[PDB]
Design a protein around this ligand. Sequence first.
Ligand SMILES: NC1=N[C@@]23[C@@H](N1)[C@H](COC(=O)NCCCCCCNC(=O)c1ccc(C(=O)O)c(-c4c5ccc(=O)cc-5oc5cc(O)ccc45)c1)N=C(N)N2CCC3(O)O
Length: 819
Amino acid sequence: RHVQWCTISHLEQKKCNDLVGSCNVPDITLACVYRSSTENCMAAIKDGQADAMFLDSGDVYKASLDHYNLKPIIAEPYSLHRELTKCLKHRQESLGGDKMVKGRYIPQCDEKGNYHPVQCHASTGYCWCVNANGEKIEGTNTTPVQTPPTCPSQVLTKCLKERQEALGGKAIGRYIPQCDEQGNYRPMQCHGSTGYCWCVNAIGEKIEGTNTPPGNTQPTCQSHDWDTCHYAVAVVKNSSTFQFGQLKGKRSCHSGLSKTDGWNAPVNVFVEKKLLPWDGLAGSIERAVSKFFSASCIPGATETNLCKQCIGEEEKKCKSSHDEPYYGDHGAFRCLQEDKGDVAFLKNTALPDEHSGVYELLCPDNTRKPLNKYKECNLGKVPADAVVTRKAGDKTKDINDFLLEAQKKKCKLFGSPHGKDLMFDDSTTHLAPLPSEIDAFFFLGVKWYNAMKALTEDVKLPSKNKVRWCTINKPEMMKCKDWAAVSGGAIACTEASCPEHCVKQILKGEADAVTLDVQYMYMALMCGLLPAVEEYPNKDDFHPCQIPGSTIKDFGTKRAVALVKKSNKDIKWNNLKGKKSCHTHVGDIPGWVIPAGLISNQNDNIDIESFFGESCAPGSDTNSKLCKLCIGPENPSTRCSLSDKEAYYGNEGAFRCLVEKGDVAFVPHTVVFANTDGKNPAEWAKDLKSEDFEILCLDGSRAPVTNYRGCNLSGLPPRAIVTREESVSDVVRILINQQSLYGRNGFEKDMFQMFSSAKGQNLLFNDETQCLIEFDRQPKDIMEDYFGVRYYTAVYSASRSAVPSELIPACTFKHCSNS
Ligand SMILES: NC1=N[C@@]23[C@@H](N1)[C@H](COC(=O)NCCCCCCNC(=O)c1ccc(C(=O)O)c(-c4c5ccc(=O)cc-5oc5cc(O)ccc45)c1)N=C(N)N2CCC3(O)O
C-alpha cells in the first residue's frame, strides 16, 4: 500500500522526503509529490497524481467546490467549553427516563466522573467491562452467579499519560508536565531544568505570549481554559501607534489570499466596520483591499500592490508556497518582523511564545493588548484545518492508517529543521479521523461556510414567505408542482432521493420543510431541526382542526400494546421470557421496535430472538426461532414473508397468530377492536369477543383492551414537519394559511387538496391526515418534548447518544464560530 503526499514547496518536499526515510510504518509506504502551489496540489489530488495534503480551512472550502471535489478527512480535535463528563451525562439522561420503564441500566461513575471500568445492571445482576466512553467491551458479560469481571484500568488523562511517557519508565533534564487532582494540566507549567515557566490551557496546549525566563514575573495563567479554538489576530510592533480603524494606507503582511486567518477574518471585519468601501458588488474584494492598503504581501494575490512586499525569488514571489519566505502564518510574522509591513494577519498559534518583546495585538475595538490576550483581542475564531482527499475516498483508510501509525511511533510529523509549518502546522499535536460523512459544510459549520461563500458571490437569500418543500420521489415532486401552481408563490419544490437527504438540504439552506416518519425524527432532532407542525390523524374528533388552538383530547396516534387472551392468567409483563410471541413484522414500530427496545432496556441487550421461546415475526430468517410459529395459504405461503402470503403478517396477521398459537401478540391498540365483535367476517375471527382479550401493563398488572391510553407499551408520536429553528415561525404561518385554503375544510378545496392525490398514496402528507397542528414547544429536552417520555425511554433509553444514522456524528460536529 502507498500514500502519495502532495507538497507545495521545496522546503516541504524536503521534510516529506525525510519522513519517507525516518518514519517506518509497516504495510504502508509514504511518497512525496512536488507541486508549486496549494492550488496545483489540489488539482494533483483531484487528478490522482497524489492522495493527500493538509489545507487551511479557507482552502478546505475552496477544495470542496466542483472544480476540485476534495473533502476533509483528518484534523486535530478541539474543544469550545468545558462539558459534563460522559458518565455523568449518561447518569442524568437515564435517570430522567420514564419511571414506568423499570429495571433500566444506570451507569456507575467514579469520584472523577468517569465510568468505573466494571459496569453492572442492578435488576439483572449482569456485569461487564467498558471503555472510557462507557461502551461495553463485547464478550465480557458475567452473570450474577459469578463474581464481577476483572477489567483493565481506564486510560490515563493526557497529562498523566504525558507524565508517564516523559518519565519513560524511570526523568532528568527534560520537561515533565505537572498535573492537578482531576488529572488535568496545572495552568502554570515550569521546565524543571531551565527554570522557564509558561501557561497552558486545560488540555496542555501552550498559551502564546506567556513563556517566562527564570527571574521574571509570570503573566497570570487562567484556570479551567477549555476554549481551544484558534483565533485570527492582527499583530503589530509596540514601536508604532496606529489603531485598527486607521489601517487604511498601511503596509500589511497576510498569511495568504485563501487563508481564513490571513484573508476572510480580516476582510470580514474590514467590511463590518465599513473601513472597506465594498459591499456585495461582485468590484472584487481583492481589488477593494488593493485600494485600502498601500503595499502588502498576500501570497496568491494578483493585484500588483498586494504582492509588492513579498520577497520570493523570480517566479516564486507571492506564491501560495513556502518558497515565498513571507507565506503562511510564520511568513506573515517574518514580514512584520523585518519591517516590510506594519501589521501581520495570522492566528494565535503563530504568535511568539515569549511574554516580553516588541510585539502586541491590534484589537478591532481600536485598542492594543498583549500577546497573551488574543482571546479578547482578535478578529474571530477560525475553523480547524484538515487533511483532505478526493470526495470518492479511495485512499481515506490508507491515509488514516498511515497517520495513526506514524503518531503511535512518534515520527517527526510536526516540526522540522528546514522550516516551520511544513506539511502540517507546527502547533499540531494530534490528528484524528473525522466522521465518515463529514464534508466541508459540516466540518467548517454553517456560519463559516456561508461567510466564506459570501466573499465570492452575491448569495441571494430565499424568501421567508416561501416554503421550499423537499420531495423524495417523482410523484411527490409532481404533486408539489401542482401545489406551487395554486399557491401563488407560497410553495416551491426541491428533489431528494430519501428523507435523510431532505434533512441535509434543509440544514444547508436548500429546502425549508419535509414530513418525516417517526423512524427519522431522532436523526433530525439530533442535527438541530425542530418540529414545526404535526400530522393530526384522529378521525373521531375534528375540533382541533376547526378551531385552531383548542385543547386536544386525544391526538389519536397508535398505541403499541401487549395483547394476550383472557384464558392465560399467569402471563404478566415480567415473565414474557421464553413465551410465544406474535409480531406484525420486523421493523414495524408498534410490533417490533417498541417491544424490542423495552426487552433490550431490561435484559442487557439480549437478542429478541433468544428472549422469546418461539414467535412469528415476518422478515426474520426462515430457520430462526422467530419464524417457526409462522404458517406461510395456497401451499407452494413462503413462511416469514413481508407479504400477505404469510397469514400472520400485519396487524390482523399478528392477531391470528395469537388466537391460534401464541401467548402474546405485539400490535397497535386498534387491531383487537377491528377484528373481534364479529368485525372480521373470516372464520377464525368468527364473532371473537373483544372482552376475551386484555393488554399487559408494564407494572405486571393487566387491563381490558379498552384502557390502552393508560396500559400500553408506548404511544407513538405523530409524524412531524421539520425545519430550521429560525424558520419555524415562517413555516407554521405559511402552512396554516395553505391549510385554510386546501385542507379538508379549506375555502378553496376545489382548487387543490393537500391531503390526497391521484398521483399516488401519501404524497408529501399522509392521506389520512386530518390537519396539521402547530407544535407547542415545551421548556424541556426536545427529544422528550417531541417523542414523549415513554417512547424516548423505550426506544432510545432516553439517551442523546444513539447513532441510528451515520449522518449524526457529522451534523453534530462542533464548530469554531462567532456571534
Ligand atoms: N410538546 C408536545 N408534546 C406533545 C404535544 N405537544 C403534541 C401533541 O401530542 C398530544 O397528544 N397532545 C394532545 C393531548 C392528547 C393526549 C396526549 C397526552 N398524553 C401524555 O401526556 C402522556 C404521554 C406519555 C406518557 C408515558 O407513558 O410516558 C404518559 C404517562 C406517564 C409518564 C410518566 C409516568 O411516571 C407516568 C406516566 O403515566 C401514565 C399513566 C397513564 O395511566 C396514562 C398515560 C401516562 C402521558 N405533539 C407531540 N409530539 N407531543 C409530544 C409529547 C406530548 O404529548 O406532550
